[PDB]
Write a protein that binds this ligand. Structure first.
Ligand SMILES: Cc1ncc(COP(=O)(O)O)c(CN[C@@H](COP(=O)(O)O)C(=O)O)c1O
Ligand SMILES: Cc1ncc(COP(=O)(O)O)c(C)c1O
Lengths: 418, 408
């Protein structure tokens, strides 16, 4: 009785755009950025329609990569927690790349191909985004050039290998394939690189060679594409007649959480009354959730995109080298930040020691190793268990289980196995 | 409609035992050094030992095992590989039983749960086992976590250090991992077996024997029901052979129907690696299951319990012998045998990955060259054949293996 499957012939056929349903208007963002970006991707940012039809070509690849993903009920975790709540896991880890990121990668590549792009480029550090764009590129028969921070290129090889199995060309950055890259290599032939440097690398290469750049950021389009997870989950839960009392997840930039929660939150906002509790968490080592300044700031280190109004601890923030928690990003998506400032979504932060302890507990109890990023949601369940206990009612929790941790086992090892 | 899901409440409730349905009696285990036999009784779970020569065609899956089956991802889906079909000219229809969909990424968890469960009923204080790829190691580590058993895993050592993430995975499940030869491959089975005889531990076997294959036929029982669900009778059932459990597990429930009805119409093809070529260069004879000789001799296609794979070999299927029941069937011409190089398999793996989007285990990639042969054959006859594949595992923790061969 623990897995709820949505047949592939019943997958949702539109994405959800919360913009029209926000309590107040979203604080507008503040080119080139138009030559390298897919035309429709630019269009969908300002979108005023509540829904965007998913192209049939995109929908077909969604099915190809494992969608719809199941909801799993974590009954053993429930028992451990005293059977005071019910825990439903939306398993985005079940996609072939093991995370929710392929949901927007497929759409970005599709719209690049529509623009008649000769290839797509993107930046990557740890390789989560890179491997997702690599798969999406392969499924559209699109040439992919991935610019990977040279340090990570050697340090975290398995995801490089994954990108290469998918047939992507992977370039250590700064690369000699661009002027901006060659100019840095003349300073240091083994220049360690940065995420910012790789964005500049990927952008210049698309710009100069008639390609398109695939943005993996907190832009409104990206969140919209990922809401296929929430669209599915809404249908699954209504299928077994359970309405969640809590929806929770973690915030890198916030796209995975929003993607799950927004379709539920949209219903409520349109009814005028928010009844559910929404709780998202990040890492206290990178505390933009709980200690962020709400202000206009650069969504990327390259200063490529215009500033967005978001919770941020600054685009130059770097985490301690001990941090293996994976939620390194400095800001929160503008829509989510707006929601947090209005008290609609509650913010939490946990240490990696606390989160990884829960990861370990979850792996032994339920049997599935969560991504280190995902592990930061688990401490929220303890807090919810207590409040439920004081309810007299059994509360239902829906969790964005954003990825598995098989390719992050080295991260866990560095904390858990000394 | 590329994925066929079997609802969990539709999961089969019994295992298939092919022993009564074989064309002729299986060569019984042999035992010279009259110690390994009572030794087997000392380290094996009692009810596992008992099921080894079980006579009932179907064995009820214990409720506790069935419960965990549902927990770790059963039933697994069947996926139709339409993009691969296109690449092969649409000359065949290709269905993949995705045993990779379980929590540890392979079919191994199917018997690991049953062995550990039966060890628990013996009041075992711990279980031991060996592992190569660590697909088995991690499945036993997970099974042990779920049944609250302490687990000691003996890992081949070359794999130990080259596959640290699999070691990390076992440790995340709370198992203790030991490089083999250890402190107390082939050699690993011997290591584990030894360690179990003292202290008070049970040895968990991960293939070859009848009980182990029987436990894995849950996959085949599910697949039979799923194919019927879409009105699809396979012409070919294919897979790869390490010890032969994942292939037997899928095929035996289909092959049983045929043996009982009198006629075998389907084609059965299994592949191994040419670098460890017991499938096509081995001899059907009695040989030792373990290096070290502590275990009763079994009659299988073998290339010697002392065979050691080439350093350059990253393809997996390293065991030296084929399961006795599967060896009987190969000897009788019922199952056809193939072997491919890691170079040819991995090139197919990379193609499959770009086409279908899913990275196969290096073990599983040995089935892909079979598809190419079936498709060329169908092209020449003009007949459009249906193929069911045991997709035994994914390769997410084996990317280092792939890289050593493909990425310079
Ligand atoms: C992914 C996967 N697929 C097939 C098998 C072959 O074993 P069987 O024929 O099913 O019994 C395996 C076996 N993996 C074992 C053995 O390690 P190897 O390195 O020799 O492949 C394991 O210990 O994990 C497999 O993992
Ligand atoms: C598995 C996993 N979970 C969470 C995140 C955080 O990303 P985001 O909040 O932007 O979607 C990432 C990047 C990830 O790979």
């Amino acid at each position: 009785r623990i897995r709820i499957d949505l047949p592939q012939d019943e997958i949702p056929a539109q994405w959800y755009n919360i913009l029209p349903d926000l309590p107040e208007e979203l604080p507008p963002p503040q080119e080139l950025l138009k030559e390298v970006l897919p035309s429709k991707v630019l269009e969908l940012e300002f979108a005023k329609e509540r829904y965007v039809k998913i192209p049939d070509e995109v929908l077909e690849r969604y099915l190809q990569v494992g969608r719809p993903t199941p909801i799993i009920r974590a009954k053993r975790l429930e028992e451990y927690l005293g059977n005071n709540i019910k825990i439903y896991l939306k398993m985005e880890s079940y996609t072939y790349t093991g995370s929710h990121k392929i949901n927007s990668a497929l759409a970005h590549v599709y719209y690049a191909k529509l623009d008649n792009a000769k290839f797509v480029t993107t930046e990557t550090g740890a390789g989560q985004w890179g491997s997702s764009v690599a798969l999406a590129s392969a499924l559209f028969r699109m040439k992919a050039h991935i610019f990977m921070v040279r340090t990570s290129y050697y340090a975290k090889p398995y995801r490089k290998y994954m990108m290469q199995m998918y047939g992507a060309e992977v370039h250590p950055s700064p690369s000699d394939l661009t002027e901006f890259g060659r100019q840095l290599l003349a300073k240091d032939s083994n220049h360690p690189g940065s995420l910012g440097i790789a964005i500049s690398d990927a952008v210049e290469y698309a710009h100069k060679n008639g390609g398109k750049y695939v943005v993996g950021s907190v832009v409104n389009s990206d969140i919209m594409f990922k809401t296929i997870a929430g669209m599915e989950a809404k249908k699954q839960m209504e299928l077994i007649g359970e309405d969640p009392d809590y929806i929770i997840g973690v915030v890198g930039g916030g796209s995975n959480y929003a993607a799950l929660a927004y379709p539920f939150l949209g219903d409520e906002l349109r009814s005028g009354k928010v009844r559910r509790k929404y709780i998202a968490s990040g890492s206290s080592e990178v505390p933009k959730m709980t200690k962020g300044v709400y202000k206009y700031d650069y969504p990327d280190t390259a200063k490529l995109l215009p500033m967005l109004k978001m919770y941020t601890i600054g685009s130059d923030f770097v985490p301690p080298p001990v941090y293996a928690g994976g939620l390194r990003y400095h800001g929160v998506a503008p829509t989510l930040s707006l929601l947090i400032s209005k008290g609609i979504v509650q913010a939490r932060d946990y240490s990696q020691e606390e989160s990884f302890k829960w990861a370990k507990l979850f792996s032994e109890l339920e049997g599935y190793i969560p991504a280190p990023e995902t592990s930061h949601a688990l401490p929220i369940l303890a807090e919810i268990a207590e409040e439920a206990k004081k309810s007299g009612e059994r509360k239902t929790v829906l969790v964005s289980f954003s990825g598995h941790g098989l390719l992050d086992l080295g991260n866990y090892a560095s904390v858990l196995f000394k």
